[PDB]
Design an enzyme around this catalytic site. Structure first.
Site, PDB file in Angstrom:
ATOM      1  N   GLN A   1      64.510   7.608  17.882  1.00 56.42           N
ATOM      2  CA  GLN A   1      64.016   6.235  17.834  1.00 56.42           C
ATOM      3  C   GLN A   1      63.369   5.917  16.492  1.00 56.42           C
ATOM      4  O   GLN A   1      63.672   4.883  15.877  1.00 56.42           O
ATOM      5  CB  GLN A   1      63.038   6.021  18.996  1.00 56.42           C
ATOM      6  CG  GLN A   1      62.128   4.756  19.075  1.00 56.42           C
ATOM      7  CD  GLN A   1      62.795   3.382  19.016  1.00 56.42           C
ATOM      8  OE1 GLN A   1      63.858   3.194  18.442  1.00 56.42           O
ATOM      9  NE2 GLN A   1      62.155   2.411  19.655  1.00 56.42           N
TER      10      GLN A   1
ATOM     11  N   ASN B   1      51.401   8.428  10.661  1.00 62.62           N
ATOM     12  CA  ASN B   1      51.382   7.033  11.093  1.00 62.62           C
ATOM     13  C   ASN B   1      50.029   6.371  10.858  1.00 62.62           C
ATOM     14  O   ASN B   1      49.971   5.185  10.517  1.00 62.62           O
ATOM     15  CB  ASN B   1      51.770   6.939  12.567  1.00 62.62           C
ATOM     16  CG  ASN B   1      53.264   6.812  12.766  1.00 62.62           C
ATOM     17  OD1 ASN B   1      53.930   6.042  12.076  1.00 62.62           O
ATOM     18  ND2 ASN B   1      53.802   7.575  13.709  1.00 62.62           N
TER      19      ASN B   1
ATOM     20  N   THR C   1      50.835   9.075  20.431  1.00 62.61           N
ATOM     21  CA  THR C   1      51.398   8.301  21.532  1.00 62.61           C
ATOM     22  C   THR C   1      51.609   9.161  22.774  1.00 62.61           C
ATOM     23  O   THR C   1      51.038   8.887  23.833  1.00 62.61           O
ATOM     24  CB  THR C   1      52.713   7.653  21.094  1.00 62.61           C
ATOM     25  OG1 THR C   1      53.615   8.666  20.635  1.00 62.61           O
ATOM     26  CG2 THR C   1      52.464   6.658  19.970  1.00 62.61           C
TER      27      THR C   1
ATOM     28  N   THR D   1      64.636  13.902  21.166  1.00 63.39           N
ATOM     29  CA  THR D   1      65.860  13.880  20.371  1.00 63.39           C
ATOM     30  C   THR D   1      65.571  14.205  18.911  1.00 63.39           C
ATOM     31  O   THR D   1      66.245  15.047  18.309  1.00 63.39           O
ATOM     32  CB  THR D   1      66.547  12.521  20.493  1.00 63.39           C
ATOM     33  OG1 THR D   1      65.964  11.610  19.558  1.00 63.39           O
ATOM     34  CG2 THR D   1      66.379  11.958  21.894  1.00 63.39           C
TER      35      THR D   1
ATOM     36  N   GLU E   1      69.674   7.869  23.995  1.00 62.22           N
ATOM     37  CA  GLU E   1      69.672   6.712  24.872  1.00 62.22           C
ATOM     38  C   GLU E   1      70.217   5.503  24.113  1.00 62.22           C
ATOM     39  O   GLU E   1      70.080   5.422  22.887  1.00 62.22           O
ATOM     40  CB  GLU E   1      68.266   6.416  25.420  1.00 62.22           C
ATOM     41  CG  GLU E   1      67.385   5.539  24.550  1.00 62.22           C
ATOM     42  CD  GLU E   1      66.465   6.345  23.667  1.00 62.22           C
ATOM     43  OE1 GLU E   1      66.913   7.389  23.149  1.00 62.22           O
ATOM     44  OE2 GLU E   1      65.302   5.931  23.490  1.00 62.22           O
TER      45      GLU E   1
ATOM     46  N   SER F   1      61.627  12.128  13.741  1.00 61.03           N
ATOM     47  CA  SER F   1      60.201  12.322  13.922  1.00 61.03           C
ATOM     48  C   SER F   1      59.978  13.595  14.720  1.00 61.03           C
ATOM     49  O   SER F   1      60.818  13.993  15.532  1.00 61.03           O
ATOM     50  CB  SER F   1      59.554  11.137  14.640  1.00 61.03           C
ATOM     51  OG  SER F   1      60.297  10.777  15.792  1.00 61.03           O
TER      52      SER F   1
ATOM     53  N   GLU G   1      66.909  19.307  -8.266  1.00 58.36           N
ATOM     54  CA  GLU G   1      65.611  19.623  -8.854  1.00 58.36           C
ATOM     55  C   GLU G   1      64.453  19.002  -8.090  1.00 58.36           C
ATOM     56  O   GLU G   1      63.311  19.074  -8.552  1.00 58.36           O
ATOM     57  CB  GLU G   1      65.544  19.199 -10.330  1.00 58.36           C
ATOM     58  CG  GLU G   1      65.842  17.732 -10.609  1.00 58.36           C
ATOM     59  CD  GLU G   1      67.330  17.441 -10.700  1.00 58.36           C
ATOM     60  OE1 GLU G   1      67.715  16.445 -11.345  1.00 58.36           O
ATOM     61  OE2 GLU G   1      68.126  18.255 -10.197  1.00 58.36           O
TER      62      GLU G   1
HETATM   63  N1  GTP Z   1      56.227   5.041  11.327  1.00 57.16           N
HETATM   64  C1  GTP Z   1      57.032   4.789  12.355  1.00 57.16           C
HETATM   65  N2  GTP Z   1      57.037   5.633  13.445  1.00 57.16           N
HETATM   66  C2  GTP Z   1      57.852   5.385  14.497  1.00 57.16           C
HETATM   67  C3  GTP Z   1      58.689   4.282  14.495  1.00 57.16           C
HETATM   68  N3  GTP Z   1      59.381   4.277  15.653  1.00 57.16           N
HETATM   69  C4  GTP Z   1      59.006   5.349  16.384  1.00 57.16           C
HETATM   70  N4  GTP Z   1      58.047   6.034  15.686  1.00 57.16           N
HETATM   71  C5  GTP Z   1      57.384   7.279  16.100  1.00 57.16           C
HETATM   72  O1  GTP Z   1      58.157   7.892  17.107  1.00 57.16           O
HETATM   73  C6  GTP Z   1      57.323   8.632  17.969  1.00 57.16           C
HETATM   74  C7  GTP Z   1      57.855   8.520  19.390  1.00 57.16           C
HETATM   75  O2  GTP Z   1      58.716   9.603  19.653  1.00 57.16           O
HETATM   76  P1  GTP Z   1      60.254   9.545  19.195  1.00 57.16           P
HETATM   77  O3  GTP Z   1      60.553  10.543  18.103  1.00 57.16           O
HETATM   78  O4  GTP Z   1      60.588   8.142  18.754  1.00 57.16           O
HETATM   79  O5  GTP Z   1      61.078   9.892  20.528  1.00 57.16           O
HETATM   80  P2  GTP Z   1      62.644  10.234  20.417  1.00 57.16           P
HETATM   81  O6  GTP Z   1      62.878  11.665  19.997  1.00 57.16           O
HETATM   82  O7  GTP Z   1      63.275   9.279  19.436  1.00 57.16           O
HETATM   83  O8  GTP Z   1      63.193   9.957  21.900  1.00 57.16           O
HETATM   84  P3  GTP Z   1      63.443   8.426  22.313  1.00 57.16           P
HETATM   85  O9  GTP Z   1      62.252   7.594  21.909  1.00 57.16           O
HETATM   86  O10 GTP Z   1      63.662   8.294  23.797  1.00 57.16           O
HETATM   87  O11 GTP Z   1      64.662   7.961  21.556  1.00 57.16           O
HETATM   88  C8  GTP Z   1      55.930   8.047  17.840  1.00 57.16           C
HETATM   89  O12 GTP Z   1      55.027   9.066  17.484  1.00 57.16           O
HETATM   90  C9  GTP Z   1      56.013   7.042  16.711  1.00 57.16           C
HETATM   91  O13 GTP Z   1      54.999   7.295  15.771  1.00 57.16           O
HETATM   92  C10 GTP Z   1      58.690   3.427  13.406  1.00 57.16           C
HETATM   93  O14 GTP Z   1      59.432   2.447  13.402  1.00 57.16           O
HETATM   94  N5  GTP Z   1      57.860   3.684  12.334  1.00 57.16           N
HETATM   95 MG    MG Z   2      65.357   8.882  19.721  1.00 56.31          MG
END
Ligand code: GTP
Ligand code: MG
Ligand code: GTP
Ligand code: GDP
Ligand code: MG
EC number: 3.6.5.-
Lengths: 426, 97, 431, 429, 215
Positions: free
Chosen positions: D11, D198, D171, D137, D63, D132, D246
Site C-alpha cells: 500500500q 513517518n 499504526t 505484503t 489486495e 514499507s 557509486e
Molecule cells: N509516508 C507514507 N506512508 C504510508 C503511505 N501509505 C501507507 N503508508 C504506511 O504503510 C503502513 C501500513 O502498512 P502497509 O505496508 O501499507 O501494509 P501492506 O503491506 O501494504 O498491506 P496492505 O495495506 O493490506 O496492502 C503504515 O505504517 C503507513 O505509515 C503513504 O502514502 N505515505
Molecule cells: Mg500493500
C-alpha cells in the site's frame, strides 16, 4: 613530424580534454566542423603534431576517448566542438566503475582494454615519427585511475622507447569528493611511479585559491577551471609546433627535468595571470613575469615550496623577447633563494623560448617545477590510507572482486619508499 | 562490452540534455569588479588581431632589409679591391684541371 | 559590509518601528510590497526574487501589537517567520519577561538573530528598541542582552529606552522594573539613549503647531532621531562616523553609558516660512532646555561629552564658528578634565519629509548626542520612588511567586547607590 | 544506457509511486496518456512506434483496492495493463501470509513481468524497490522478491526505499514482528536501504512548511522529490554525474552496515521562499540539524560514517567545498576516526521541478544528503526492546505459525539483530 | 646580436683570401704562428672596433688605440683575465686603410708596457697581416660603418681558468650520480666520464707546465 597521441579516460579526463581541444583549435584556427579558417601559414606548419590530416582540408584530432559509462561523452560529443572527433574513436563500457579501482582494472577494464589498444594501434602506426603519448585522468576516480593506468601498462609494454606523460588531478587536502579516494589513489600512483616518464600533478583547491585571489573571480565554474589546466597543457609542447630562438621538445624537458627515474613528479604553472579589471594596468615585462612565476601561490598544486627545495625548474617562454634578461633573471632568482634550491647542482633552471605568442597575449610562459616539497602531498595520502586500512574500512569492494591485501601493503610500501627518497635528497 | 549504438533499443545514439546557462545566478546585485568569464585570458579581438610572422618581417633580425637597404654597403662594393683572376691564376686553375 | 540588526522587543519598540520602517523605505525607492521600480543593505537584504526584506526581528509576548503588522500594508515586505509572537502577555511584571514565560521563546529569537547575522558580512552593531517601564521591554530585552553579549562579545550594541518621566506615568510598578532592568543591562550594554515622553509632549506642544497628539507623532520623531544615527552608511558625507565610533566617544566609564538625544529643527510648517534656518542658530537651538528630549535642566550638571551629526546642505566652515561660540558662554557648563568636549559629523543628504507627517521640509538638521551629569537627579528620584514602596515590600508578593526571591531588590539597590556615588564622584574636581 | 526498474509493492509503495510517476511525466514532456508532443526520458520511459510512452514499473499488491484506483485513475492510459499485477487476498499484516502462502502463489507473475522489462532494457544497472516495513505484503512479499532477484540477476545493485516504524507513533500493533523478520532476511541481499520515518516528515511539514493537518499525499510528494534527486544524474548533465553504482561502493563500508538515511534541504513554502536567501552555504548548513531529517533519531548519539551530497540547479563547486569544510570544523558534527575523507559531491545542471498545485517552492537550488550514521543503532535498540517484551509471552505467535512458520526463526532473527547492533557498536570505537 | 659578431670575426679571419693587401696571411701561417705545440691550440678572439653608429663619429679611430683597447680584459669573447696568464703567440689582422708604419709603432708601444707579461721562449710574439679592404656593414646592423678594423687571436694560458670551473661543476655533479641514467642507456659506460675528466685534467696540467722556465 613529431606526432603525439592524446588519451582521455574518466569524466575528469574527458572534460579536461574537451577544453584542451578548445585551446588547440583556437590556436590553429580550426572551425567546429573541422576546417581551417585562420590567417597565418605558421599555424598550419606543424598541424600534424596534434591533428591528423584528411582529404579536402578536413583535420581530425588524434585523440582516444574512453570510460566505463556513457554519461560524459554524450555531452562531449553534443558540445560546441564535438563534431571534430572521429566516430570510430568513441569506445565505451557498460557498468560504471563506481569509484572502484578493482572494477576499472580487472573485471571491466580487462574486457575493454583490447578495443582501446585497437584504436591506439590504428592511430600510432599511421604517424610519420611518433614523439610520445599524452593522457589525462584523475587519481581519485574509478574509471580514470583504474583504467588509464591499465592503458599506461599496456602501452609501455609495446613501445619501450617513447615518452609517457600523464595529466593527473590529485586528491584535495581539505575536502574529499569520494570516500575511497586514498584507496583509489594509492594504487594508481603506485602503478604510475614505475611506468611513466614525466607527470604533472594538479590540485583543485590550489586552483580555487588562485582563481579567488589573483584572478579576482568569486564564481568560477568547472569549465573555466579546466582552462588553466589547458593553459599549462598546451604550453609544454609549443616548441614542437612553432619555431623559436631556442627550441625544446618534450624529450629535452624529460632529460633536463628527471635526475633519477623515480623522481618525476612536477608542479605546473602559468605566468601571465591577471584580473579582468586590471588588464589595462599590467605592463607585461620579463621581471614581473618571472616574479609572478616563482610566487608560491601561482602554483597549480597544493604544495607550498617553502617547506621543500627545488631540484630542477623548467620555464618555457613564448613570444617576442630578448635573451640576456632571461638568463639574468634565472641567475637572480637562483642567487638570492639559494636556500630553496639544491647546492649540489650548479644550475637548476632550464629555459626555452619560442617566437609566436598566443592569440591575444603579448608574451606568455609556462612553469614546470620539480620540488622536494611534494613529499607532503603523498604523506597525507599515506596517512589517510593507513587510517582507513587499519580498520578495513571499504576493502570488501576490492577483495570482493579478486584482489589481495598484500597488494595494498606493497602499494603503501612503494609510497613510503618514494617519500623517503624525496626526503633523503634534502 | 562495447556497443555499436548508444541509443534506445540498440539503434542510433543518446542526445543528452544540455545546460543552457552553465554560469551562476547572481542572487544579489552583480558586482562591476567581477571577472566572471575566464576566456578573456587570450582572446583575439574581432577583425584586427596580430598574425604569426617570421624573421624577415621582424625588425633588427636576420635577413631583414638585406636587398632594400643595400646602399649602405655600396661604397665597399664599388671599390676595385677584390682579387681579379689574371692570366697566371687562371693558368694554375687550368694546370690542376 | 555596513549592516545593522534591529530587535523591536515589547510594545513600545514595535510601535516605534512601524513608522520607523516607513521612514526607512521612504528615504529609498522601495515600494511597501518590497519591490524597487548599493546604499540600501545597511537596513535591507536584496533577494534573488527581487524582494527587499529588512533585517529586523519583531518580538512581543502578546499578539495584539504584531498582528496589525501581519495584516497591514507591510505584510508583503517583511519575512513572516521573524515576526515572533508569544501567547500570554508579560503584563508589566519583570518576572514574566525574564524568568517564567520569556525563557521558552528566547531560543527562537536567538536562532533568528544568528540566522540574520550569518547572512551579513560587515556587522557593526545592534538597534534594540525597548522601554524601562513595562514587563516585556524590561524583562525580555534584559534576557537576550545576556545572551547576545556572551555569544557575540566585542560588537557594539546600541539600545533605545523610554525612561519613566517625573510627573506623568502610566504604570505604578515601573520604579521596580526600571531598577531591575538597570541592574542587569548595566554590565552588558554599550550605549543606550534615554527619551522621556513628557519632554516630547512639551516639544510637540510648544514649537510644533499640532495639539492633541497621538503616539504616531512621537514615534515619527523617534524614527527621525534614529535615521540620523545611520545616515552615514547609506549616504556618504564630509565627516563620516560609523556605529562603533559612538561607542568610544560617549562612555567615559563603563558604568556611565546613558546619553540623551535632541533634534534641533523640530519646527512647524507655518513657522518655517519665517525662520532663517542657518547652522548658527541650529547649533544652539538644540542646546536649550525646551528642546531636550529628557525633562532635566542642564545647569545643575555639566556636559561631560557631546557628539553632533549634521545633515543636508551644511558647509563645515560655519560649523566651526557655531561650535566655538558654545563653549565661550559661562552657562554651558564644562569642567577641567574634559577640555575637548565635542565631535562633529556632516553629510550631504537633506532630511526627508513623510507625507502626512507634521515635520516641515527643512534642509539643515543636526542631532545632538550628549551624556550629562544632569541625569543623576532622575536616578535619585527613581531611587526615592523605589525606597518609598519597599518600606513595607508592597508589590513584591507578585514578583516572589514567579521565580526569584526577595533578595534581588537589595542587589539592585546596592547597584543603584553605587551608580549614584559614581556620578557624584565624577562631578567633583581634583585640585 | 542508464535505466532503472522500479518495484512498488505494498500500500505504501503504490501510494508513493502514484506521486513519483506523477512527477516523472512532468519532468519530461510525457502527457498523462503517454504522449510527448531529446531522449532523456529513456531512464524511465520506453518507446512504441505510434509515439506512445510506457513506463518501466511493476505495481504489485495482494489486495485489489489500491491498484484498482490506478486502473481507474488519471493515469489509466499510461501504464501497461499487465504490469499492474494484483492479487485477491490481502496478507493482513502477516509476514507468514505474504512470504509463505499468498506471496509464493503470485511471485512468478511479477518476476515474469520484471524479466520482460529487463529484456526490453539494454544497460540496466539498478533496482528501485518501494515498500514499507509495516504491513504484510511490503515486508514479506518484498522480502521474497529480493530473495528471488538476488539469486537470479546476480550482482545488480538493488536500492530499497522502505518506511521505518517510528518508536512513538505507529499504526499497527504487530509492527516489531513484521519488521524484525524482513530486516533479518534482507540484510544479506540488499545493497543500500534508505530509511524514511513517518513522524519526521510530519514535524517537518508542521515546522518548515506552515502546513497544519497534512495527509499521506503530502509525504509522498517529498518522497518522490528525494527519489528524483537520487536518479537526477542519469537524466541531465552536470559537473559531477553520480550513477547507481557509486551509491553502492561509496555509502556502505561493511557488508552489514548498510542502513543510510535521507534529507532534502530546501524544503520551504512558496511564500517564505521570496524572503529567504537560498545560498548554497546556507542550505548545506541547514541540512545537518536534528530537526530537518526524515528519521526521528538524533545524530548526536553517534558519529557519521559516510555522507553523499547531490546538488541540482546552478550550484558551483567552491561553495560546496567551503560549506563541507566549515562542516568539518564544527565540534558538534562528529565523524569517525577511520574515515578521514567523509563526503562525496555530485553536481547537476537543472532546477528542481514543482508540480502545479503542489506545496514545495519554485527554487533553483536543491540538496539531497544520503547520510549514514551510527545513531540508527538506537532505532534498532528500541525495536529490539519492543520485540523482547512481546515475544516473552508469545503475544501474537499463533497467527504466524498457523501459516507455515516455526518457532526457531523467531529465535534466530533476535540473534541476527543482536549481531547487527554489535556490529554498529564496533564501528564506533 | 652575437651571431653578427661571430660572422665579423670569421670574415676578418679569411679576409686575406678575398682581397689584396700589403701583408696577406694565408690559412697556413695562422697554424704555424699561433700553435706552438700540437695540444696547445686554444686561443681567444678579440674584435676591437666594436662601436655604435653614434659613438663612432665623435672620435678619430687611429690604429694606436684600437690596438690598445683590445688588450683590455673587457673586450674578449671568453670570460678570462689576461693578466693572470702569459701570452704565447699573437696574431693581428688589420682591415681597411692602414699604413704599415703605425702598426709597428703601436707594436713598439705594446712591447714597452710592463703591465702585461709574455713567456720567455717567444722573443718575437707578434705576427701581423694588413688587409687593404675595409669591413662591410649590415642593414639594421648594430655595428657602425667604419674604415679600420682589427681582429686579434691570442694564445694565452688564462683560458685554462675557463676550464677551471667546468671540471669543478663535474665534481659537484658526478659525486651524487645525477643525470647519469640518460647517458648509460644508449651504449655508454659509467667510466667514460672518468677518462674524459682525466683528459681534461691532463690538458690543465699541460697549460700549467708550459709557462714554467728551466734555468
Ligand atoms: N509516508 C507514507 N506512508 C504510508 C503511505 N501509505 C501507507 N503508508 C504506511 O504503510 C503502513 C501500513 O502498512 P502497509 O505496508 O501499507 O501494509 P501492506 O503491506 O501494504 O498491506 P496492505 O495495506 O493490506 O496492502 C503504515 O505504517 C503507513 O505509515 C503513504 O502514502 N505515505
Ligand atoms: Mg500493500
Ligand atoms: N513613544 C511611545 N511610547 C509608548 C508607546 N506605547 C507605549 N509607550 C510607553 O511605554 C510605557 C510602558 O511600557 P511598555 O513598553 O508599553 O510595556 P511592555 O514592554 O509592552 O510590557 P507589556 O505591556 O507587559 O507587554 C508607557 O509608559 C508608554 O509611555 C508608543 O507607541 N510610543
Ligand atoms: N578541474 C576539474 N576536475 C574535475 C572535473 N570533473 C571531475 N573532476 C575531478 O575528478 C574527481 C572525481 O573523479 P572521477 O574521475 O570523476 O571519477 P571516475 O570518473 O569514476 O573515475 C573529483 O575530485 C573532481 O574534482 C572537471 O571538469 N574539472
Ligand atoms: Mg505589552
Amino acid at each position: 613530424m613529431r606526432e603525439i597521441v592524446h588519451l582521455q579516460a574518466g569524466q575528469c579526463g574527458n572534460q579536461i580534454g574537451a577544453k584542451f581541444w578548445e585551446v588547440i583549435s583556437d590556436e590553429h584556427g580550426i572551425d567546429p566542423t573541422g576546417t581551417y579558417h585562420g590567417d597565418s601559414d605558421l599555424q598550419l606548419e606543424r598541424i600534424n603534431v596534434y591533428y591528423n590530416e584528411a582529404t579536402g582540408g578536413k583535420y581530425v584530432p588524434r585523440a582516444v576517448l574512453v570510460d566505463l559509462e556513457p554519461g560524459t561523452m554524450d555531452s562531449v560529443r553534443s558540445g560546441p566542438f564535438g563534431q571534430i572527433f572521429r566516430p570510430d574513436n568513441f569506445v565505451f563500457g557498460q557498468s560504471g566503475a563506481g569509484n572502484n579501482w578493482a572494477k576499472g582494472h580487472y573485471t571491466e577494464g580487462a574486457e575493454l582494454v583490447d578495443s582501446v589498444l585497437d584504436v591506439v594501434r590504428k592511430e600510432a602506426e599511421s604517424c610519420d615519427c611518433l614523439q610520445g603519448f599524452q593522457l589525462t585522468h584523475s587519481l581519485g576516480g574509478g574509471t580514470g585511475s583504474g583504467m588509464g593506468t591499465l592503458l599506461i601498462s599496456k602501452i609501455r609494454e609495446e613501445y619501450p622507447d617513447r615518452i609517457m606523460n600523464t595529466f593527473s588531478v590529485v586528491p584535495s587536502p581539505k575536502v574529499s569528493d569520494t570516500v575511497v579516494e586514498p584507496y583509489n589513489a594509492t594504487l594508481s600512483v603506485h602503478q604510475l611511479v614505475e611506468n611513466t616518464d614525466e607527470t604533472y600533478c594538479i590540485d583543485n583547491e590550489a586552483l580555487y585559491d588562485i582563481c579567488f585571489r589573483t584572478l579576482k573571480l568569486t564564481t568560477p565554474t568547472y569549465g573555466d577551471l579546466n582552462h588553466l589546466v589547458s593553459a599549462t597543457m598546451s604550453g609544454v609542447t609549443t616548441c614542437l609546433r612553432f619555431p623559436g630562438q631556442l627550441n625544446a621538445d618534450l624529450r629535452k624537458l624529460a632529460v633536463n627535468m628527471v635526475p633519477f627515474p623515480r623522481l618525476h613528479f612536477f608542479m605546473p604553472g602559468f605566468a601571465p595571470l591577471t584580473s579582468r579589471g586590471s588588464q589595462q594596468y599590467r605592463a607585461l615585462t620579463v621581471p614581473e613575469l618571472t616574479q609572478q612565476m616563482f610566487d608560491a601561490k601561482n602554483m597549480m598544486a597544493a604544495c607550498d615550496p617553502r617547506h621543500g627545495r627545488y631540484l630542477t625548474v623548467a620555464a618555457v617562454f613564448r613570444g617576442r623577447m630578448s635573451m640576456k634578461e632571461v638568463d639574468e633573471q634565472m641567475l637572480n632568482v637562483q642567487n638570492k633563494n639559494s636556500s630553496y634550491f639544491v647546492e649540489w647542482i650548479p644550475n637548476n633552471v632550464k629555459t626555452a623560448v619560442c617566437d609566436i605568442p598566443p592569440r591575444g597575449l603579448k608574451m606568455s610562459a609556462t612553469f614546470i617545477g620539480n620540488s622536494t616539497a611534494i613529499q607532503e602531498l603523498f604523506k597525507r595520502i599515506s596517512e589517510q590510507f593507513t587510517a582507513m586500512f587499519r580498520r578495513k574500512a571499504f576493502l570488501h569492494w576490492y577483495t570482493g572482486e579478486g584482489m589481495d591485501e598484500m597488494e595494498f601493503t606493497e602499494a603503501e610500501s612503494n609510497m613510503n619508499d618514494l617519500v623517503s627518497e624525496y626526503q633523503q635528497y634534502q | 562490452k562495447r556497443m555499436v549504438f548508444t541509443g534506445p533499443a540498440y539503434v542510433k545514439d543518446h542526445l543528452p540534455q544540455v545546460a543552457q546557462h552553465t554560469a551562476y545566478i547572481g542572487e544579489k546585485r552583480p558586482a562591476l569588479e567581477k571577472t566572471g568569464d575566464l576566456r578573456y585570458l587570450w582572446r583575439p579581438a574581432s577583425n584586427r588581431s596580430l598574425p604569426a610572422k617570421y624573421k624577415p618581417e621582424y625588425v633588427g633580425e636576420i635577413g631583414w632589409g638585406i636587398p632594400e637597404y643595400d646602399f649602405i654597403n655600396k661604397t665597399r662594393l664599388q671599390t676595385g679591391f677584390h682579387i681579379k683572376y689574371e692570366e697566371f691564376s687562371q693558368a694554375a686553375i687550368d694546370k690542376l684541371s | 559590509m555596513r549592516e545593522c540588526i534591529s530587535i523591536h522587543v515589547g510594545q513600545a519598540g514595535v510601535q516605534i518601528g512601524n513608522a520607523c520602517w516607513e521612514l526607512y523605505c521612504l528615504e529609498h525607492g522601495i515600494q511597501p510590497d518590497g519591490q524597487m521600480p548599493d546604499s540600501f543593505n545597511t537596513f535591507f537584504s536584496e533577494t534573488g526574487a527581487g524582494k527587499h526584506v529588512p533585517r529586523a526581528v519583531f518580538v512581543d509576548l502578546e499578539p495584539t501589537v504584531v498582528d496589525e503588522v501581519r495584516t497591514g500594508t507591510y505584510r508583503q515586505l517583511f519575512h513572516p517567520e521573524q515576526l515572533i509572537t508569544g501567547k500570554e502577555d508579560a503584563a508589566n511584571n519583570y518576572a514574566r519577561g525574564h524568568y517564567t514565560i520569556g525563557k521558552e521563546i528566547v531560543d527562537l529569537v536567538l536562532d533568528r538573530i544568528r540566522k540574520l547575522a550569518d547572512l551579513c558580512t560587515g556587522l557593526q552593531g545592534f538597534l534594540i528598541f525597548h522601554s524601562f517601564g513595562g514587563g516585556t521591554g524590561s524583562g525580555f530585552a534584559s534576557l537576550l542582552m545576556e545572551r547576545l553579549s556572551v555569544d557575540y562579545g566585542k560588537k557594539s550594541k546600541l539600545e533605545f529606552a523610554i525612561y519613566p518621566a517625573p510627573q506623568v506615568s502610566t504604570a505604578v510598578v515601573e520604579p521596580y522594573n526600571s531598577i531591575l532592568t538597570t541592574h542587569t543591562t548595566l554590565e552588558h550594554s554599550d550605549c543606550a539613549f534615554m527619551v522621556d515622553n513628557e519632554a516630547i509632549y512639551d516639544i510637540c506642544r510648544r514649537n510644533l503647531d499640532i495639539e492633541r497628539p497621538t503616539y504616531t507623532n512621537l514615534n515619527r520623531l523617534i524614527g527621525q532621531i534614529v535615521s540620523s544615527i545611520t545616515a552615514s552608511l547609506r549616504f556618504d558625507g564630509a565627516l563620516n562616523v560609523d556605529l562603533t565610533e559612538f561607542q568610544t566617544n560617549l562612555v567615559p566609564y563603563p558604568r556611565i553609558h546613558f546619553p540623551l538625544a535632541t533634534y534641533a529643527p523640530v519646527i512647524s510648517a507655518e513657522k518655517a516660512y519665517h525662520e532663517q534656518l542657518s547652522v548658527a542658530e541650529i547649533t544652539n537651538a538644540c542646546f536649550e532646555p525646551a528642546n531636550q528630549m529628557v525633562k532635566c535642566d542642564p545647569r545643575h550638571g555639566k556636559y561631560m561629552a557631546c557628539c553632533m551629526l549634521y545633515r543636508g546642505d551644511v558647509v563645515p566652515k560655519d560649523v566651526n564658528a557655531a561650535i566655538a561660540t558654545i563653549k565661550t558662554k559661562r552657562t554651558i557648563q564644562f569642567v577641567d578634565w574634559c577640555p575637548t568636549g565635542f565631535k562633529v559629523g556632516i553629510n550631504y543628504q537633506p532630511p526627508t519629509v513623510v507625507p502626512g507627517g507634521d515635520l516641515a521640509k527643512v534642509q539643515r538638521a543636526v542631532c545632538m548626542l550628549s551624556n550629562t551629569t544632569a541625569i543623576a537627579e532622575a536616578w535619585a528620584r527613581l531611587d526615592h520612588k523605589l525606597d518609598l514602596m519597599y518600606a513595607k515590600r508592597a508589590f513584591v508578593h507578585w514578583y516572589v511567586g514567579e521565580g526569584m526571591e526577595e533578595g534581588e531588590f537589595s542587589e539592585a539597590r546596592e547597584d543603584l547607590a553605587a551608580l549614584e556615588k559614581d556620578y557624584e564622584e565624577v562631578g567633583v574636581d581634583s585640585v
